[PDB]
């Protein structure tokens, strides 16, 4: 078997993008944040506390003639970004982009932290990093991948991510009309439950090559692009007035700038993110400072390549007995 689905930015920033994903019968579709940071398949329900609802679509398992409650199971997780959720689960038909598993693990949100409150367009999370870090207990559920794979054509998924444009999510299949040039496939540690993998250096516009090596996961629900200090302090040195503001929380630089681009190697292969990729809008309303898409890791105990970088490339999960991942220009 395989799916695919369509995902699109939840704004003009690209802060997010959301898939749609059917639960339930009869469907009940709910647009997800499809996180390869994370390993919980959580949704705004019919349980999350009324006030921590404002306009997303919720999961009513009461509705649904194949969900059943899967007795004594909660769940809790806390984010990178300081945002939370908890509640109970049930197991229900999941489907994404024709793709179907039954038995899913839904994990059915009591509360929610007031930063997915605010934001109307994710109906919850559909977490693509390995099930070791689910967090439902006594008994930890194992992702819609982890579910699917025996399925699949190939233990694959794809993503495909734009820039202010939609993209895709496949599963089970490599479109080789996606990507241009060939894929470099490059080796995964999975021993902190992540896509975990060393970049073999970086270069700052049209600058030379520095080869070191820079352990990072790769996080389609991390929206920026977390380096150490060292590199980003190189990248933005290249930008006049732009500067580190810890008031503002990382760095800024002047909406009248042209920014460079930032390429990261993958093996011998290099990916080219776009100057534009990284300018990320006013800090407020009006301002004539800009928020940057690459920010410092210093502090958070890892490199995150999320969405700044991801949408850069086509991006391979593999998910073969000894996974990897790959990553061509597009
Ligand atoms: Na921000």
């Given at each position: 078997?395989?799916?695919?689905?369509?995902?699109?930015?939840?704004?003009?920033l690209?802060?997010a993008?959301?898939?749609?994903?059917?639960?339930?019968?009869?469907?009940?579709?709910?647009n997800?944040?499809?996180?390869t940071?994370?390993?919980d398949?959580?949704?705004?329900?019919?349980?999350?506390t009324?006030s921590?609802?404002?306009?997303?679509?919720?999961?009513?398992?009461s509705?649904?003639?194949?969900?059943?409650?899967?007795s004594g199971a909660?769940?809790?997780?806390?984010?990178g970004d300081?945002?939370?959720?908890?509640?109970?689960?049930?197991?229900?038909?999941v489907?994404?982009?024709?793709?179907?598993?039954?038995?899913?693990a839904?994990?059915?949100?009591?509360?929610?932290?007031?930063?997915?409150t605010e934001?109307?367009?994710?109906?919850?999370?559909?977490?693509?990093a390995?099930?070791?870090?689910?967090?439902?207990?006594?008994?930890?559920?194992k992702?819609?991948?982890?579910?699917?794979?025996?399925?699949?054509?190939?233990?694959?998924?794809?993503?495909?991510?734009?820039?202010?444009?939609?993209?895709?999510?496949?599963?089970?299949?490599?479109?080789?009309?996606?990507?241009?040039?060939?894929?470099?496939?490059?080796?995964?540690?999975?021993?902190?439950?992540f896509?975990?993998?060393?970049s073999?250096?970086?270069?700052?516009?049209?600058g030379?090559?520095?080869?070191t090596?820079?352990?990072?996961i790769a996080?389609?629900?991390?929206?920026?692009?977390?380096?150490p200090?060292?590199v980003?302090?190189?990248?933005?040195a290249?930008?006049?007035?732009?500067?580190?503001?810890?008031s503002?929380?990382?760095?800024?630089?002047?909406?009248s700038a042209?920014l460079?681009?930032?390429?990261?190697g993958?093996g011998?292969?290099?990916?080219?993110?776009?100057?534009?990729?990284?300018?990320?809008?006013?800090?407020?309303?009006?301002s004539?400072?800009?928020?940057?898409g690459?920010?410092?890791?210093?502090?958070?105990?890892?490199?995150?390549?999320?969405?700044?970088?991801?949408?850069?490339?086509?991006?391979?999960?593999?998910?073969?007995?000894?996974?990897?991942?790959?990553?061509?220009?597009?």
């Open positions: 078997s395989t799916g695919s689905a369509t995902t699109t930015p939840i704004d003009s690209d802060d993008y959301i898939t749609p994903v059917q639960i339930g019968t009869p469907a009940q579709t709910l997800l944040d499809f996180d940071g994370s390993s398949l959580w949704v705004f329900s019919s349980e999350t009324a921590e609802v404002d306009g997303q679509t919720i999961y009513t398992p509705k649904s003639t194949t969900a059943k409650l899967l909660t769940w809790s997780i806390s984010y300081g945002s939370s959720s908890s509640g109970d689960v049930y197991t229900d038909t489907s994404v982009g024709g793709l179907t598993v039954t038995g899913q839904v994990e059915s949100a009591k509360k929610v932290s007031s930063s997915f934001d109307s367009t994710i109906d919850g999370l559909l977490g693509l390995f099930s070791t870090l689910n967090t439902v207990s006594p008994t930890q559920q992702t819609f991948f982890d579910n699917a794979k025996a399925s699949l054509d190939s233990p694959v998924f794809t993503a495909d991510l734009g820039y202010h444009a939609p993209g895709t999510y496949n599963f089970g299949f490599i479109d080789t009309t996606a990507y241009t040039g060939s894929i470099t496939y490059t080796a995964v540690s999975t021993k902190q439950g896509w975990e993998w060393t073999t250096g970086y270069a700052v516009g049209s030379t090559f520095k080869s090596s820079i352990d990072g996080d389609t629900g991390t929206t920026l692009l977390y380096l200090a060292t980003v302090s190189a990248y933005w290249q930008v006049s007035g732009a500067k580190s503001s810890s503002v929380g990382g760095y800024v630089f002047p909406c042209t460079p681009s930032f390429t990261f993958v011998s292969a290099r990916i080219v993110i776009p100057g534009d990729y990284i300018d990320f809008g006013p800090i407020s309303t009006g004539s400072s800009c928020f940057g690459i920010q410092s890791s210093a502090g958070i105990g890892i490199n995150i390549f999320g969405d700044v970088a991801l949408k850069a490339a086509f991006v391979v999960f593999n998910g073969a007995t000894t996974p990897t991942l790959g990553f061509a220009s597009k």
